[PDB]
Amino acid sequence: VNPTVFFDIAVDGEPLGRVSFELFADKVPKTAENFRALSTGEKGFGYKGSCFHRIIPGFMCQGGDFTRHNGTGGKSIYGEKFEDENFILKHTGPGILSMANAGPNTNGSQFFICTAKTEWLDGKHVVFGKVKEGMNIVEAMERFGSRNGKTSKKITIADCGQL
């Protein structure tokens, strides 16, 4: 059975609401497990306290840099980077959860939640989950974004874990 994790989202420190995700361990076990463990913090590091550093209305919200907190960092539970597990699943619409990277086989911890279909990223980014509950929170987040991604307020993962 696929794990479920949650993010408690805050905006300049004030709570907004909870987003939960189904992680497709049945198709991408290695990628789902990285995101699961980073959500629990069980390796002694992970998503708690980090920001959504890039939000572009009509496209996606991206976050997960808990090592440098500036959009350039992050690391997996397997080392700094790990390989593209597979590209079975596609960027079919809003709510898809998928790995950010800097080219082939550079998965770390950064990820992005789609707010629209982004099919041109198929075969380049590993899809590994989707929003289960709280898609309205992700939509609420979009108005803090902009054309180039800079956010006008600090959007943070105040708490996270496994359900």
Partner: protein, 169 residues
């Protein structure tokens, strides 16, 4: 009052487009790689005694969006065509950027400067003479730079302003 110049920085992923620009604007360099969506900056400078305002567009090297460059190329007045001296593929990409700019502006006479960046590094794979020959064939200046040491950073942007002035007379 002072003339505004619309500079556009183009080139392959990771060649130093943003590091050159941030050195110009903020006088510092970081080794981390923050890949660009699109950024814009303003700075006033003095070039050949004349004060002017630089409007700088820092563009994405991401190749998947090559079809989305037309509007910023129409708007721009001059182009820093940046490659990295340790990255032969970025030097080869220069020709495709230059052809796109000429095609989009429908002119053989567009202000441009060839920039070979990361000249602080020892792993050079593009000879200086190889870049100067290309620039000579294009009829544009070639300037070597390092964003890390600041070598040539002012010179590259200022030379492009001089090219734009010559174009407008």
């Amino acid at each position: 009052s002072m003339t505004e110049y619309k500079l556009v920085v183009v080139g392959a992923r990771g060649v130093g487009k943003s590091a050159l620009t941030i050195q110009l604007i903020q006088n510092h360099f970081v080794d981390e790689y923050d890949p660009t969506i699109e950024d814009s900056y303003r700075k006033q400078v003095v070039i050949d005694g004349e004060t002017c305002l630089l409007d700088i567009l820092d563009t994405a090297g991401q190749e998947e969006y090559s079809a989305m460059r037309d509007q910023y190329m129409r708007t721009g007045e001059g182009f820093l065509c940046v490659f990295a001296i340790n990255n032969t593929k970025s030097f080869e990409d220069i020709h495709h950027y230059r052809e796109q700019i000429k095609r989009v502006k429908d002119s053989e006479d567009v202000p441009m400067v060839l920039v070979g960046n990361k000249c602080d590094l020892p792993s050079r794979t593009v000879d200086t003479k190889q870049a100067q020959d290309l620039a000579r064939s294009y009829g544009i200046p070639f300037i070597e730079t390092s964003a890390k040491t600041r070598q040539g950073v002012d010179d590259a942007f200022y030379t492009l302003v001089r090219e734009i002035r010559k174009h407008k007379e």
